[PDB]
Amino acid sequence: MSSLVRRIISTAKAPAAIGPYSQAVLVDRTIYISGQLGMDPASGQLVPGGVVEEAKQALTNIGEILKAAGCDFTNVVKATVLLADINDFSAVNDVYKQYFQSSFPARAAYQVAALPKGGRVEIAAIAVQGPLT
Amino acid sequence: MSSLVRRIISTAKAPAAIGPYSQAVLVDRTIYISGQLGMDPASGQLVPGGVVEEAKQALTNIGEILKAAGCDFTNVVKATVLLADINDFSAVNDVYKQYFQSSFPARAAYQVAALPKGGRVEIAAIAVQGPLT
Amino acid sequence: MSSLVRRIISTAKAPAAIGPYSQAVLVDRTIYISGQLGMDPASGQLVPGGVVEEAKQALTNIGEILKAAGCDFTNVVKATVLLADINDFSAVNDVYKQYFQSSFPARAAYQVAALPKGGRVEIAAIAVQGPLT
Amino acid sequence: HMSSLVRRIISTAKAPAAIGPYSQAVLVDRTIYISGQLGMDPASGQLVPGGVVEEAKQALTNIGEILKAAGCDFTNVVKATVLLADINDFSAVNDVYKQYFQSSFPARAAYQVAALPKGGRVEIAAIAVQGPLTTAS
Amino acid sequence: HMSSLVRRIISTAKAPAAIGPYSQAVLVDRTIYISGQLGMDPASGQLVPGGVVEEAKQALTNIGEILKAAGCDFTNVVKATVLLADINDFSAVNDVYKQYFQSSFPARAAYQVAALPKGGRVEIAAIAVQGPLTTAS
Amino acid sequence: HMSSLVRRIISTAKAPAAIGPYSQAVLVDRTIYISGQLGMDPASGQLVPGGVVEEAKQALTNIGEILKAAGCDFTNVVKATVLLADINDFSAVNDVYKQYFQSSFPARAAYQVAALPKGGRVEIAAIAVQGPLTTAS
């Protein structure tokens, strides 16, 4: 009946919350990361340029949340890729692969009906705090 | 190679199953909670009044499942909010915030094409059994 | 600050990856399984026959990934069932129940706008490596 | 940061009280460290009469009450230490000790010491692990 | 496969150096096994003068420096062993030992031995658990 | 409820058999408690001839076989106890013991006792932790 560590992860290097959620929660060694839209952290607005630029921004935001938790992309074990349009699958895959360079996470990827703020992509993730063997 | 505790959480204070699933599963210290529609526990029928009343009922149902597992809303670490209509985002956020009063979970929220029983909202969650520090 | 085990699960008894993901990731004792379409493992093509045959194939694929990790369906604690059409709920439930014969997982099930490859169903899961009590 | 592990000080009236800055036992995480027990009567404060066999019986009774206070029994013991005033009493003490265990026997340290507190002829200490335990050998 | 647990060899200059194939203490996972400490002056390499009370004070100072090197203090000690050259010195040594603990006291082993290294009159060893710890009793 | 932790009773024919209600070693969770080993020949049932140095070599051989039966080697030992019939034999025994360890040395207890079983001149016990272990100091 040990008391397990639970910590809210919060960094100004990622966007402010637009609803009642934390950027991520660390509990024991597992980090649950909220869905990230392609919002610029300074302004909270979706970056221009459509799905490719939004995907890059979403992943960069995930990277800053990971870093705040003492992690990097190699600590990610599962990701969820929500698309506004299934036709963008190939383009989003090519962006995604540039960040998750090895030990590729488990994943689910599919088209939803609509995302907050009219986003074209939103990515959530689960990570495990290192060290990992 | 310890044998980890796995327990099916089941309470008549939450709706009966409408498919082949458990209300929640506790494994080690993590509790995976099934998606809850706004069904009345006694009748299994969706409450009238649309998305706001359904969201309240769904969250109340989650609360009873948490309580059966010796938890409350403060043990939730991640939630998924599935909407039938993205226009309801603000209204559902305001209901949601009334239950998750602190240590806000990580979250993903988005519009799907359709929910079972024609629900307007469905909420799933992950919690960690306390004590948490 | 122990170093936790993280292992990529990979078996030729399940389909090759069609994107930048692992079939599953084992970390500590938790196994995150990627969404499985009803693809034949040998060819990578969706099996004919629609949602019922695809659901059977998806679940068989999950079973082979579990087996590669020293597990079976009784180790599953949470599943996500993504449908291309909510009208298929009853048919998919009846297939699903044939594999998850006891200790039914927690679950969320709902209709999405579109799945990769035009699939009619996709199933992801979380399992915990045994022994479980 | 790290998890906060549970510690319980065990203190039962059915075993001799721990006079001074020690405890009968300390449970930390799942491991229970049990202080050495003499053949002391909990209600007299000195040794039971009759010598080493009588003292061994009382010491093991005392350990059993401390185990029960920690939610354990003798099946949870993983290591014991048997200290003797006379090595030649080992067989007699072992004939008492063997009655408390049926299988999956603890590891053991046993030897004669120069002197025990209270003039004792035997003192038994133990380490136990809180269950459930699965024995695979 | 299993997780890789952390092990740290503790080696502080504020306690007597561990001459030869032993360490002052070993931390493994959360548990710290501390070698028996004599009343040795870290900078002389032999016992402090003045007998058992002076030696007990120095031994406990030495243990405290090893605990600090492992990120602990005396509140993390869960079991201690007090070895004596003379059982009749127990009360005097206990009056020193009690100053180092205020509550949640360790389990204890204590007895007279035939001989300690270096002609010591007291030697104290300990097991501690790295915090945080929550004491529920 | 709590997880069920693994316990294995270790019982190898390459070390002297544990006669009576004790085991050569008990593994529980990741920790192995190894009973004190004398310089006993596994196939004779009594001490090897030649005195303390010969007995120390045989005792350490016996411990090594018990470690191997638990899937460990001497690098997994975190604490050892060296009991002697004569404190003046410590250096000779240490010259044997040092051959079994190369670094990350165990914590140690060592002292002379009034009598060991079987008339032994040395008895070595140990605590080990099943690997993998990462040593960070």
From Swiss-Prot, chains D, E, F:
The free-text tissue note of the record is:
Expressed by various malignant neoplasms.
Per the record, the major location class is cytoplasm
The top of its lineage is: Eukaryota, Metazoa, Chordata, Craniata, Vertebrata
Q: What class of enzyme is it?
A: hydrolase
Q: What does this protein do?
A: Catalyzes the hydrolytic deamination of enamine/imine intermediates that form during the course of normal metabolism. May facilitate the release of ammonia from these potentially toxic reactive metabolites, reducing their impact on cellular components. It may act on enamine/imine intermediates formed by several types of pyridoxal-5'-phosphate-dependent dehydratases including L-threonine dehydratase. Also promotes endoribonucleolytic cleavage of some transcripts by promoting recruitment of the ribonuclease P/MRP complex. Acts by bridging YTHDF2 and the ribonuclease P/MRP complex. RIDA/HRSP12 binds to N6-methyladenosine (m6A)-containing mRNAs containing a 5'-GGUUC-3' motif: cooperative binding of RIDA/HRSP12 and YTHDF2 to such transcripts lead to recruitment of the ribonuclease P/MRP complex and subsequent endoribonucleolytic cleavage.
Q: This chain belongs to which protein, by name? A: 2-iminobutanoate/2-iminopropanoate deaminase
Please give the organism: Capra hircus
* Residues modified to Phosphoserine: S137
Hydrolase as a keyword of this entry, yes or no, is yes
Q: Which UniProt keywords apply?
A: Acetylation, Cytoplasm, Hydrolase, Lipid metabolism, Mitochondrion, Nucleus, Peroxisome, Phosphoprotein, RNA-binding
